[PDB]
């Protein structure tokens, strides 16, 4: 693997995928034990540790379909990763997505061309692994963590003069981020299991920025849900 | 409503949507009491009855995005229908998909241009109402009905020399049908709840067909699950 | 054939194709003799009878490219049908299309993706069989039935928020319907002969709905023209 | 008119449109009396004369959609030309298309993006003026000139490694040329009457070429038919 | 070669490509010696002569991607031409392109479908031969001829209701013409060397037409630069 | 600037843009004096120092169009950066491309949809600032550093089953990377100067890899050339 400098067995079967390598660090150091950093290439830190005994990895993906695709492919093809769970944030684009909501994406729209490259005239609809999603949902409900299940939009252009998010909101899409289409497509293509869990970093359409206290409570809830999404 | 010859009231808040108006007839007569036909326009029959103190309607949609779009639109816009649940068949495209599996579609791919017409360069991924999906799942588990949750492909062309079934199957898609993309897109667009439940009518790739005994059994399973999808 | 429950030789070489299976019934019972219903699958009635001795069939197609494609393919591949003539209605989109005009389509624009699925970057222009069209034209002129020859638009979305009919009208397109692209494409692909004859059910752009007396006179004229379109 | 150096009046209401300005010269000198050259801009010659008390013009168009679009636009917009009739050659792509057949194009497919640029997700099918087509047909029958009526393909690329000639031929398309789509689109757009009449210059697939004797004969046939297309 | 009536060795290794065959004449007669016309087909004159001893050809291309593609392909495939240099004009679309500027195109945007025909979802960016461009630049600078190096837009529709030139200007595109994409694509595809040199015939966006004195001085400068662009 | 944690002033007018923030670190520490880190957000390090009385900055971009677009946008919009110069690696796709060649990109192709999203039916060709390209060329020649000038391909997918590398190579494209299209598009759009300088990290087709010795040598060459691109 060209972008991960790790050996056999150093990466667990289950990998959390924050976008930010500094969040991978924070997650590993805060939630796991027996932490080893297995990757330093390009500063895209990957870590491996244990949670209640179980080997878990946490790997930064960087931003956008192309960056996450690199890491997901190597993780899957060279380290045989079976469960891939994005933990990151999105801009909410609907009023009924609350700042405290943990979002589970069932599927993801995109303006990436990756699927049209593969399918031409077909619209490929990526799809979360249902078992992972059902576990994550039940984990939230059992504790009373508020959870919303729906779809997201995977954007190529964080800054997009030709954005269609008002239309997307109207069709029921919950928020915008920059990875999920890739995660879900590449995972299912190789018989692996994918899910994205998201918290709300802002409300793109109305203006309202969240507060530090909100984001950090929900981030905690997200990770806790994640740590229970594999049975 | 150009294609439904019914007056408001006559159609329930929850509508089952088989492709075949003769299946709509079957479902109503077999599962409901106090059954009335509210539509004969174009032979596309619809019926209303009760199932245990709940008014339910059953409406033939015809085959294909354009045909289902017509009925769904008019049900939504003219009759204020809130829950819309496709009950139909698909051609299975994966071996791991069994002839007894009731399929619950989370999303669907398509070669229909309906969404590119609306979104251009965006791949829009339609999305089941999770609430309906989860109830249908829990109902199937309660009875021990086997169930598979994943994605389907909505085809414009039952006979397609340029089909990409093999690529879709390699990407995890469970089966082929002709309605789901439109159902989920139109329902979400108007804040309504949609779910597709499908039985296996054949295995597309292996050619292997499914007996009558298996079909009727799974059909029964699908309807009974469907009648349990609204909370 | 999965959607037509008929045996060998039960379907004639020449088939009329109304969209509405109840119009197939009306046509068969009103214009033909020795009528047998050969199909009841999905309520999509097909009939076979004689007109001045000659075996003629009439088969409902349902609405939209996908539905008609199913029936045209089975009719052609399993029953060896040689002449396929759509008889239905359209919404007129030009002022000079009069309520009494029988429209013969030379070709058809579309927002269906079926041809882009097959041809990619090519715009496939479907084309009527000229011999059938010339016969239908001469039949109308010999009696003095008013006839207009031009093109139509084959729409996927009867309800389309992104319709381009004002632009299409300007380019000379006569009306909107939901079948012709399919009929013409599939027919010529298999060396068979296709034509669509259309009457005006309304004027989409200006508002004016026709009258029952108009539609029924012109419908009669359409069928009469059809019954003379095969030499 | 940037590319036609003529003053209003000088160009007839009916214009023949060969690709080759030297053919335009030939046609004028051979078939018309009182012949004047009205344009030398860019060597793209045009001529006006009379044929039996009717003023007719003959204008070279050059090769390809962009070139013909230039001349057609300026003829329509600057000189109020009402009838525009391409007389040219095509590469035959079906065996059933004979070296002696005069081809009358009802419509044309294309890999030109000219219509997608205007219509996006709509496949626009251009359409001959039926009145002209029918007169040309009746004129050919009167003389016993063999004639084929159907569709052609308008190519941007005479030499195309990515050609789809075989698929087009299987779909009934008669031959390849480089003008028709633009002629018919632009003429219909401005309420003008267009027709393309084509001779066979070669058989594209079988490689088999057409003698001079056959070419000149069919050419004669095409011009004589053309001079009979306006009522 | 179907469109060039020339024998072996009659065409030089270096060919200038004006759009206008009458400019090919003017160029050959004005700048070269020992001039022979090798082509008269379709009036698209090609000439061959000497400049300070060196064999140079000048060949009219006609207008648009399809026309120039024909000539470039034949020149390359049948006459083994190695250096192809377009000399023509463009409409300037940016204020800082002055009437006296000789434009050298590094690359070219287009609304032609030729590259999408070949590459589908890929945007192919055509590219000038750097050696030819560097020579042409140095030739201009050594004499003090003002030169601007950037990109152009290769248009299919000289008359385009759907033009995007305001957007293109904003992205830095210098001017509009109708050939360069073709020249550059076809050349590099066959390992040959391409460049387009352009003068400003007008300012498309602001209105200002140049003067005859301007155009003719700059045209001279263009040809002089061209005659030094091959080492 | 959501992703750069710097205050105005801190970032130079000229910025080098490696993909790897650890390369950004290397470049700064090795080539500049008085080095300060101005950004640690997301581990995407940036640095400013001086090289011979000139303030220069070095900013990691991450991998892929979406990631570089983020940093480039914020550098342009929030820090008024005028010169932006990618220094990175590519997979060579032509044998004539040597392991020692420093590549200067004139333009780039892409399978990113970023430009179709903005332009629809137009293929937008991005363009290096010639002034920067020419200085980089002249600097390389001065030292005798081998250099190749041509086009690259910007890929969304490092691992792409549907790659068209062979076709691109046949069309003259020099190598594959993941940034250039966005750099050149965004820089030109805001009147800024962009150039990409690339070293060969591998030969994509022949599989043949490049030693450390060769890599470090060419890397040195690239940086030294880069530091000479602003006049
Ligand atoms: N525009 C945007 N795109 C992607 N992720 C985001 N998070 C917040 N705003 C975003
Ligand atoms: N094999 C098949 N192909 C397409 N649509 C279908 N619906 C059911 N079976 C199908
Ligand atoms: N919008 C429409 N689409 C198709 N057929 C029609 N007939 C009348 N209106 C129509
Ligand atoms: N073979 C051919 N290919 C493309 N255009 C043509 N025009 C005439 N013959 C042709
Ligand atoms: N619109 C245009 N297209 C191409 N070349 C041109 N030269 C001047 N105006 C032009
Ligand atoms: N082989 C390759 N494919 C894609 N992007 C690359 N960047 C560097 N090498 C590459």
Residue numbers in the entry:
A (entry chain A), B (entry chain B), C (entry chain A), D (entry chain B), E (entry chain A), F (entry chain B): 2 to 232
Sentences from the paper on this structure:
Purine nucleoside phosphorylases (PNPs; EC 2.4.2.1) are versatile enzymes that catalyze the reversible phosphorolysis of purine (2′deoxy)ribonucleosides producing bases and (2′deoxy)ribose 1-phosphate. The crystal structure of BsPNP233 confirmed that it is a homohexamer with D3 symmetry as observed for other hexameric PNPs. Analogously to other hexameric PNPs, BsPNP233 is a trimer of dimers where each subunit interacts with the adjacent subunits forming two interfaces: the catalytic, which contains the active site, and the inter-dimeric, involved in hexamer stabilization.
Two subunits were observed in the asymmetric unit of both crystal structures and all of them exhibited clear density for the ligand in the active site. The crystal structures of BsPNP233 in complex with hypoxanthine (Hyp) and adenine (Ade) showed that the purine-binding site consists of residues Cys91, Gly92, Phe159, Val177 and Met179. Hydrophobic interactions are predominant in the stabilization of both ligands. Superposition of BsPNP233-Ade and BsPNP233-Ade-SO4 complexes showed a preferential orientation of Ade in the base-binding site, except in one case where it is rotated by 49° around an axis perpendicular to the base plane. This alternative orientation is not followed by significant conformational changes in the active-site residues; however, it alters the solvation of the active-site pocket. In the alternative orientation, a crystallographic water molecule in the ribose-binding site is absent. This solvent molecule mediates a hydrogen bond between the AdeN9 atom and the carbonyl group of Ser90 in the presence of sulfate ion.
